Design a protein around this ligand. Structure first.
Ligand SMILES: [Co+2]
Ligand SMILES: [Co+2]
Lengths: 355, 354
C-alpha cells in the first residue's frame, strides 16, 4: 500500500485558458477574500471575468502559462524515486501535487489518491516559510477535503509545514548565487548587492503574528553564513498590490533607488522553489526588463530541478517520516494566531491515523 | 591608549534627566522620522508633553535607568578580558557613549582625547543593526570627530552588528532554559516563547533597514540551540504615535494568547541589559497587569552574564584582529538610511587619517 507524497502550493494556470478557473478559485476563498455566502458564488465570478483579461496577457507574455505544475510534478517525482531507496518501510512513494487554486485542486488529487488506495500521506508544503496565508490555506482546505471525500478516514495524514534551513535548500541557493555572481565583471563581483526577494504580506496579516516574515529571514541569514558574508545583502518584498499597507522594503522601489549608485544587483527567489509569475514576469520583465539598469541587474536562477535541492527535500521527507511527528511544534501556535472563516479547530484531528 | 566605547541610546540615570533625554531622543530625525523640517521644534513639544508619565515610570522601577551602570560594568569587564586576551593592544579603557542619555558622544570623545587614546572601537551594544540606532550613533560620532578631533588623533573602527555572536546565543539559551524550569514540568514544552524586540516605525522598515531580519536571525539561531522544543514567535514592543509600526505588538499578542496558553515567556531579544522596557513595559505592564500574571514570566536580561560578556570580549578580539574598521553591510546601510546629516564617506570616518 503506497505512501502518498503530495506537493502543495498556491498554484498557477498551466496554460492561459486556465486563468478563469484559477482566478475563480482564488476569488471564492474566505480564508481571506469576502463575506457573503451564496450571495457570493455569484460576486465571485462578477470578479473573475473582470480580472481574466489582464492575467491572461501576463501569462501570454511569459510563454503562456505558469511552469509551477510542470516543475512541481517533477520535483515530486524525483523526491519519490529517492524516497524509494531511502525509506523502504514506506515502500512505494507516489508523486502527487495538490494546488490551492490551480489544477489539480486538493479535492481532485484526494479522489485520485483514494482510488490509488493510499494509506499514508504527507502534505509536503512547498513553501519553506510558513504563512497562514499559504501553507495555512492548504491545511484548512485539506481538512475540508478529508471531511468531504473521506470521513471515517482511510488516509492518515502528516504534514511538513516548514523547512527554512534545510541543508539542500541552503546549499542550492548558494552555488546558484555564486554561479550567477561569476557572470559579473569581477573588479566588482564582491560589491554586487544580493536582494533576496520574497512575496510580501499585507500588514494586517504580518501584525497578526504570522510566522512568514521571520522564517524567510532565517533562510537569508543562513545562505549568507554559507557565502561567508562576501557581498552586501538585504531582504525585500514584492508582489504587493492594492491600497492596503504591505510589508515594506519593496523590491522594485529599492531596485530603482539603488540602481544608479550601485554597479551590481542580484534578485533571489528566496521564498519559492521554481519559476512562476513572480520571477518570469514580475522580476524578469518588470524590475529588470523595464529598468534603465537592465545591465547591472541579474536574477539568480530559481531552484527548479536543481539536484542538490531535490536531495534536500528527500532528506526532509525522510526525516519527517521517521520522526513520527504529525506536524512541527509551531503549527498549533500558527493556527491560534491565524485568521480564517472556516479554520481547523483541532490539528490533531486532521492529521494522524483515525482508522 | 586603546578605547572600547560601548554605545546604545542610554537611559535617564536620575528620575529627571528625563526631559533632556526624551527631548534629545525625539529631536533625532534618524531614530523616528517625524518631521524632516521641524523635528527639534516638534521634539521639545513632545518631550514636555510625555515627561510626566515617563518620570513616574522611572520611579515605579527605582527612580532611574540602570542602563548606565550595566553598560559601564560590561564595558570594564569586557575590557579586563581583552587585557589578558589581546596584550597586543596594551590597556583597554572602558568607555560608554550614549546617544540621548547622559555620557553623550560629546562628553566621552573629550575624555578619550584627555586620556590620549590613539585607537578606539565604537562597539554598538545593539547586536542588530538599524539606522535609527547604530546609524544615528555613528552619524553622531562623525560629527564628534569633526568638531572635537580635526587633527584626526584617534583611529576609529566600528562593530556595527553581531546577530549571532556565540556568547549571545548561548547566554540567551541558558537563560531561557532555566526560566522554563519555573514552569510546571507537564507544561514546560508548551510555554510559548515570545521574543519581544523594540518595534520600528514602518517608515524605517520600508527604507530597507537591516534590523527586522537581523533580529530574526538571532531568534532562529536561539531556537536551533534549543532544538525547537517550545513554540516561539518574534514580536515587537515599545512603539509611539499614530504612525504605523512593525510586526505584531507584544502587548496585543500577549493579551490575545493569555486565554489560549499554558504559559508565556518574554525575551528581551533586542537589548543587552535591563531598562525601562523590561522592568516596566513588560514586568509591570504586560505581565503585572494581566489577569494571567501567573502563566507569564520574563527571561532574565543578559546584564552581567559571563557567557555574554565573554562573547563580547571574544567579539572585540576578532574585530581588532582584522582590517575592516566596519562590516561589509554598512555601506548599503548608509545608502538606504535616511538622514538630514548622513555620513557621506564611511571610508573617511573610520581609519588612520593623520
Ligand atoms: Co500575490
Ligand atoms: Co525605545
Amino acid at each position: 500500500s503506497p505512501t502518498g507524497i503530495v506537493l502543495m502550493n498556491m498554484g498557477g494556470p498551466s496554460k492561459v485558458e486556465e486563468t478563469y478557473d484559477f482566478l475563480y478559485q482564488l476569488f471564492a476563498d474566505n480564508d481571506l477574500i469576502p463575506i457573503s455566502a451564496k450571495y457570493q458564488k455569484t460576486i465571485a465570478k462578477y470578479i473573475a471575468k473582470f480580472r481574466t483579461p489582464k492575467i491572461e496577457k501576463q501569462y501570454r507574455e511569459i510563454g503562456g502559462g505558469s511552469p509551477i505544475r510542470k516543475w512541481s510534478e517533477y520535483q515530486a517525482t524525483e523526491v519519490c524515486k529517492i524516497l524509494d531507496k531511502t525509506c523502504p518501510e514506506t515502500a512505494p512513494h507516489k508523486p502527487y501535487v495538490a494546488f490551492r487554486y490551480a489544477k489539480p485542486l486538493t479535492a481532485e488529487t484526494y479522489k485520485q489518491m483514494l482510488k490509488d488506495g493510499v494509506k499514508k500521506a504527507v502534505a509536503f508544503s512547498q513553501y519553506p516559510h510558513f504563512s497562514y496565508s499559504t501553507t495555512g490555506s492548504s491545511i484548512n482546505e485539506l481538512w475540508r477535503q478529508i471531511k468531504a471525500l473521506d470521513s471515517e478516514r482511510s488516509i492518515s495524514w502528516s504534514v511538513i509545514d516548514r523547512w527554512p534551513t534545510n541543508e539542500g535548500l541552503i546549499k542550492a541557493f548558494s552555488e546558484n548565487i555564486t554561479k550567477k555572481l561569476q557572470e559579473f565583471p569581477q573588479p566588482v563581483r564582491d560589491k554586487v548587492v544580493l536582494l533576496f526577494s520574497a512575496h510580501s504580506l499585507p500588514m494586517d496579516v504580518v501584525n497578526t503574528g504570522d510566522a512568514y516574515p521571520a522564517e524567510v529571514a532565517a533562510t537569508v541569514y543562513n545562505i549568507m553564513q554559507k557565502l561567508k558574508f562576501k557581498n552586501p545583502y538585504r531582504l525585500v518584498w514584492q508582489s504587493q498590490v492594492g491600497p492596503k499597507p504591505w510589508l515594506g522594503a519593496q523590491t522594485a522601489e529599492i531596485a530603482e533607488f539603488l540602481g544608479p549608485k550601485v554597479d551590481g544587483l542580484m534578485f533571489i527567489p528566496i521564498a519559492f522553489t521554481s519559476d512562476h509569475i513572480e520571477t518570469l514576469h514580475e522580476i524578469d520583465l518588470g524590475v529588470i526588463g523595464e529598468s534603465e539598469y537592465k545591465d547591472k541587474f541579474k536574477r539568480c536562477e530559481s531552484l527548479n530541478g536543481n539536484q542538490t535541492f531535490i536531495e534536500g527535500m528527500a532528506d526532509l521527507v525522510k526525516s519527517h517520516l521517521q520522526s513520527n511527528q504529525l506536524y512541527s511544534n509551531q503549527l498549533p501556535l500558527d493556527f491560534a494566531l491565524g485568521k480564517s472563516n472556516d479554520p481547523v479547530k483541532d490539528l490533531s484531528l486532521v492529521f494522524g491515523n483515525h482508522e
